Chains A and B, each alone.
With several copies, the nearest count.
Chain A
Amino acid sequence: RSFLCRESLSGQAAGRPLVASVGLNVPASVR
C-alpha cells in the first residue's frame, strides 16, 4: 500500500527479526 506521509510511514521500519506464519484457513503473515 502507498505510503506518502511521515504519519503513515511511522512504525513501518523493522525492529525485530521477521517471523513467518502459515495456517489452515488463515492468511500467511510476516512479522
Chain B
Amino acid sequence: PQDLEFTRLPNGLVIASLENYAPASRIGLFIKAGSRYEDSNNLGTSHLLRLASSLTTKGASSFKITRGIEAVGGKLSVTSTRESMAYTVECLRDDIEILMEFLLNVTAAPEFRRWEVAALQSQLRIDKAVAFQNPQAQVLENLHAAAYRNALANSLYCPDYRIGKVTPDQLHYYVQNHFTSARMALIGLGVSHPVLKQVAERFLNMRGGLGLSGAKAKYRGGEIRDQNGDSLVHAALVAESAATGSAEANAFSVLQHVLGAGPHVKRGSNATSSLYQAVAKGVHQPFDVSAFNASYSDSGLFGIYTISQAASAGDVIKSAYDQVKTIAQGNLSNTDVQAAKNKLKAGYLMSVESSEGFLDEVGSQALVAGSYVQPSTVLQQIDSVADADVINAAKKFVSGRKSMAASGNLGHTPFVDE
C-alpha cells in the first residue's frame, strides 16, 4: 500500500501523502492557528473562524460549497485544539479535486462578508452551549485559565461578551497572520504526492513565512472554582509537566498509564488503574478518576481528573493525590510499568487505525516536529522510558505548583492550598 511520502517546500509548507488505495480519500490542511494565538483583544476570533468554513470565498460562494460538497457525498470538517486548526475534506477518491479546490478556497481565499459574519455570531452561543452541556468542557477551560497567564489560558470557545463582536477585520487579520505557508502542512491519505504538490502550488502562497509569533505560555498556578450545584463535582488538579516530544513527555505518558488513563473493559473495575484502586479502597460512592496529560509545543499539564459525589469530593481527591505521592516516593514495580507501556503502545497503534486518526497524527507531527516518524520508532521511545523516569515525572508533579479547577457543589471540595 506504498509508503508515506513527506516533503517540505521552499515556502516552508509541508506536504505528506500516503496512497493506501482506499476507495475514500482524506485531505487535511493543518495550521498552527489555535486559540493560543489570540490576545485579550480578539478572544473568540478563532472559534468563529472554526465555525466560518462553508462561508463565501473568493472562488466559491457559500451555496456553491455546501451544494457542491454534498453533491459528491463529501465532508468538510474543522477540528481545533489550543495550538492547531485542521481543515479536513473527505470524499471518494474520484472527487478529491473538487473537495481540494473547496478546501483551498476556504483556507487561502476567505472573504468574511460582513452580513454572513454577523449571521454567524449566533452559532458561537449555540456551539458553546452544546459543548458546555458536558461538564468537563468548562472544567478544562477553567483549568487552562487557572494554569496559565496568557496564551494557553485562552478558551477554545468564544467569551460570552465577545459573541456578536468578533468582526470581519479580526478574522481577516487572523488568517493573514496565522494561515501562512511555514505554518501549514497539507496531508493526504489516499492521494498521490505530485497531486498534493500541484494543489500546494496553485494556492498556499500567502507569505511563505512564520506569520505572527505567538507568546510563550506562562505558568500561573491559580485556582478557578465554579459552584453550580451539579449533582457531581468535576475537579482537575494539575502541575506543569513537559512539552510534547521529549523523554520527560514520554515518562509522563507512561506515568499516565501507570496511574490509569481511562477504562479498557466495559463496566469493569479498572483493576490495573492504581489511582482507581486507591480511591475505591475508601470511597464506596460512584466515582471516576483518571490521570490527565496535556502536552503542548512549549509546555504541558499533568495531573488528576476526578468525578465524584459532592460529599465525597475531598476524599476522592486526597486519595488520588496520595497515590501519586506514593509513586513519587519510589513505590512503582517493573510489572506495573511494563503494563503501562503496553497500554500506551497499544493505544497509540489503535489511534492510527482509522484514516481520521492516522491523518491527525501525521498532521500534528508535521506541525510540531516538521518530520514524520513511523510507529516503530514511537514504540521504542516508549520502551526506552525507564522506571526512574516515571518515578521523576511523578516527583515533579508532586513537588510542582498546582492549578485546580472544580465545578459543582463545592462545599466539600478542597482548595489548592488545603
A and B touch in the complex (CB under 8 A): yes
**Chain A residues with a Cβ under 8 A of chain B:** 2-26, 28, 30
CB < 8 Å neighbour of A22 from B53, B261, B286, B290: B53
Residue of A nearest to B280 (CB): A6
Q: Please, which residues of chain B bring their CB within 8 A of the CB of A12?
A: 136, 288, 307
CB distance from B47 to the nearest CB of A (A): 8
CB distance from A18 to the nearest CB of B (A): 5
Say if the beta carbon of B398 comes within 8 Å of chain A.
no
Q: Please, which residues of chain A bring their CB within 8 A of the CB of B340?
A: none
Residue of A nearest to B296 (CB): A17
Mark contacts of B115-157 with chain A using CB atoms, 8 A cut-off: 1 yes-contact digit, 0 otherwise. 0000000000001001100101101110010000000000011
Whether A23 lies near B263 (C-beta < 8 A) is no
**Chain B residues with a Cβ under 8 A of chain A:** 47, 50-51, 53-54, 65-66, 69-70, 75-82, 127, 130-131, 134, 136-137, 139-141, 144, 156-157, 231-232, 234, 236, 256, 261-263, 267-268, 270, 285-294, 296, 301, 305-307
Contact A23 to B286, CB < 8 A, known contacts A10-B267, A14-B305, A18-B136: no
Interface of B is mostly: mixed
Q: What are 29 sample pairs from A and B whose C-beta atoms fall under 8 A apart? A: A2-B231, A3-B307, A5-B286, A6-B285, A6-B288, A9-B286, A11-B262, A13-B262, A14-B140, A14-B236, A14-B292, A15-B290, A15-B292, A16-B293, A17-B81, A17-B144, A17-B296, A18-B136, A20-B47, A21-B80, A23-B77, A23-B78, A24-B54, A24-B65, A24-B69, A26-B77, A28-B130, A30-B131, A30-B137
Interface of A is mostly: loop
Closest 9 CB pairs of A and B: A17-B294, A11-B263, A13-B290, A6-B286, A23-B77, A13-B288, A21-B79, A13-B305, A24-B54
Q: Please, which residues of chain A bring their CB within 8 A of the CB of B78?
A: 21-23
Contact A9 to B256, CB < 8 A, known contacts A19-B79, A21-B79, A24-B54: no
